[PDB]
Motif scaffolding. Structure first.
Motif, short mmCIF file in Angstrom:
data_model
loop_
_atom_site.label_atom_id
_atom_site.label_comp_id
_atom_site.label_asym_id
_atom_site.label_seq_id
_atom_site.Cartn_x
_atom_site.Cartn_y
_atom_site.Cartn_z
N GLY A 191 6.96 14.78 -6.79
CA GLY A 191 6.70 15.67 -8.09
C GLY A 191 7.51 17.02 -7.60
O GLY A 191 8.15 17.05 -6.58
N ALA A 192 7.17 17.73 -8.26
CA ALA A 192 7.64 19.43 -8.29
C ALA A 192 6.73 20.16 -7.35
O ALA A 192 5.76 20.17 -7.38
N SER A 193 7.55 20.86 -6.50
CA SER A 193 6.95 21.74 -5.57
C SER A 193 5.81 22.61 -5.88
O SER A 193 4.74 22.73 -5.60
N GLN A 194 6.03 23.08 -7.15
CA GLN A 194 5.19 24.27 -7.92
C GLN A 194 3.76 23.44 -8.22
O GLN A 194 2.65 24.12 -8.48
N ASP A 195 3.94 22.18 -8.79
CA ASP A 195 2.88 21.43 -9.20
C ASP A 195 2.05 20.85 -7.96
O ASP A 195 0.86 20.56 -7.87
N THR B 226 6.47 15.45 2.82
CA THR B 226 7.83 15.65 2.11
C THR B 226 7.63 15.33 0.75
O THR B 226 7.06 14.49 0.14
N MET B 227 7.86 16.53 -0.03
CA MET B 227 7.87 16.36 -1.53
C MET B 227 9.33 16.22 -2.03
O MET B 227 10.47 16.78 -1.71
N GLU B 228 9.38 15.44 -3.16
CA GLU B 228 10.69 14.85 -3.56
C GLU B 228 10.57 14.65 -5.23
O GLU B 228 9.56 13.84 -5.70
N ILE B 229 11.19 15.40 -6.06
CA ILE B 229 11.10 15.63 -7.55
C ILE B 229 11.56 14.18 -8.16
O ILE B 229 10.98 13.84 -9.14
N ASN B 230 12.47 13.46 -7.58
CA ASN B 230 13.20 12.53 -8.04
C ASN B 230 12.73 11.13 -7.55
O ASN B 230 12.88 10.79 -6.71
N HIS C 63 15.30 22.50 -1.24
CA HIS C 63 15.22 21.79 -2.41
C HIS C 63 16.19 22.91 -3.47
O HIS C 63 17.24 23.09 -3.04
N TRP C 64 15.68 23.15 -4.57
CA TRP C 64 16.49 24.01 -5.56
C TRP C 64 16.71 25.22 -5.15
O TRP C 64 15.32 25.79 -4.96
N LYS C 65 17.75 26.04 -4.77
CA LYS C 65 17.84 27.23 -4.30
C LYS C 65 17.16 28.44 -4.83
O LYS C 65 16.39 28.99 -4.28
C1 LIG Z 1 10.23 19.00 -4.38
C2 LIG Z 1 11.04 19.72 -5.56
N1 LIG Z 1 10.55 20.62 -6.20
C3 LIG Z 1 11.23 21.28 -6.97
C4 LIG Z 1 11.08 22.28 -8.07
O1 LIG Z 1 10.31 21.40 -9.27
C5 LIG Z 1 10.61 21.73 -10.54
C6 LIG Z 1 10.36 21.10 -11.63
C7 LIG Z 1 10.85 21.55 -12.96
C8 LIG Z 1 10.90 22.82 -13.11
C9 LIG Z 1 11.37 23.63 -11.94
CL1 LIG Z 1 11.75 25.28 -11.89
C10 LIG Z 1 10.94 23.18 -10.66
S1 LIG Z 1 12.98 20.77 -7.07
C11 LIG Z 1 12.42 19.60 -5.72
C12 LIG Z 1 13.35 18.73 -5.24
C13 LIG Z 1 14.85 19.09 -4.93
C14 LIG Z 1 15.34 17.78 -4.37
N2 LIG Z 1 14.23 16.90 -4.26
N3 LIG Z 1 13.26 17.54 -4.55
#
Ligand SMILES: Cc1nc(COc2cccc(Cl)c2)sc1-c1ccn[nH]1
Length: 213
Positions: free
Chosen positions: A115-119, A86-90, A140-142
């Motif tokens: 981290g961020a999904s795209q990374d 599971t990926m979580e940005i926060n 995650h983000w729509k």
């Molecule tokens: C796992 C994840 N990756 C995301 C996308 O990551 C980024 C980070 C910076 C810019 C952009 Cl466009 C995208 S949002 C996100 C999320 C939402 C709630 N918990 N986790």
């Protein structure tokens, strides 16, 4: 304090240690009685449960953990030996989710990636030893559902039969994503209607089974 820290305190005070069902019911109760959360739903829950049971996935990727509700929900239905990434940005939500999973007794089935999904997606094969995924849960983000689906394809992470399940595709909404998967011969799509009880509005989830290139 964060909403996620408050939900965890309520779980610690009310739920039974080591009992995923009790953890889910506690979170449902808190969110119904005290403080609404978008990621929590019991009826969205039955839909997720039905999909996990039908496909018995060995490796699931989840995008967005929040307080860990959906990780608890899926992990409790996984077979011995199965894994949830599971990926979580926060980082605060990542910490709460680990604590929620530990309380539920499901730690051995889940790896939290910070981290961020795209990374993180382009690193899954080299850093986390992934060949292909059996299922992906998008929550995650729509605005990222469609680019991340295209990225998963491009990175060779989907195989013929891989199940994508996307939540909240009607409200807030994801019209570019739905147009892409429902229009593409690379996917076979099924829509599941889902009522949002608090706001009194119809939402839904989309199931999209990858058919290969
Ligand atoms: C796992 C994840 N990756 C995301 C996308 O990551 C980024 C980070 C910076 C810019 C952009 Cl466009 C995208 S949002 C996100 C999320 C939402 C709630 N918990 N986790």
């Amino acid at each position: 304090d964060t909403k996620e820290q408050r939900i965890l305190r309520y779980v610690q005070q009310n739920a039974k240690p080591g009992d995923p069902q009790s953890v889910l019911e506690a979170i449902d109760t808190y969110c119904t009685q005290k403080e609404w959360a978008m990621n929590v739903g019991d009826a969205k829950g039955q839909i997720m449960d039905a999909v996990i049971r039908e496909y018995s996935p060995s490796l699931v990727l989840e995008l967005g953990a929040y307080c860990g509700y959906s990780a608890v929900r899926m992990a409790r239905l996984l077979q011995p030996g199965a894994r949830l990434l599971t990926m979580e940005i926060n980082p605060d939500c990542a910490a709460i989710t680990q604590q929620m999973l530990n309380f539920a007794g499901l730690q051995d089935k889940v790896t939290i990636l910070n981290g961020a999904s795209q990374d993180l997606i382009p690193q899954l094969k080299k850093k986390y030893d992934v060949d292909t995924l059996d299922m992906v849960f998008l929550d995650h983000w729509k605005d990222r559902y469609l680019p991340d689906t295209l990225l998963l394809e491009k990175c060779g992470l989907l195989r013929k039969g891989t199940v994508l399940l996307a939540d909240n595709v009607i409200v807030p909404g994801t019209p570019d994503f739905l147009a892409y998967v429902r229009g593409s011969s690379s996917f076979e799509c099924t829509h599941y209607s889902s009522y949002l009880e608090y706001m009194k509005v119809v939402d839904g989830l989309e199931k999209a089974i990858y058919q290969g290139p």
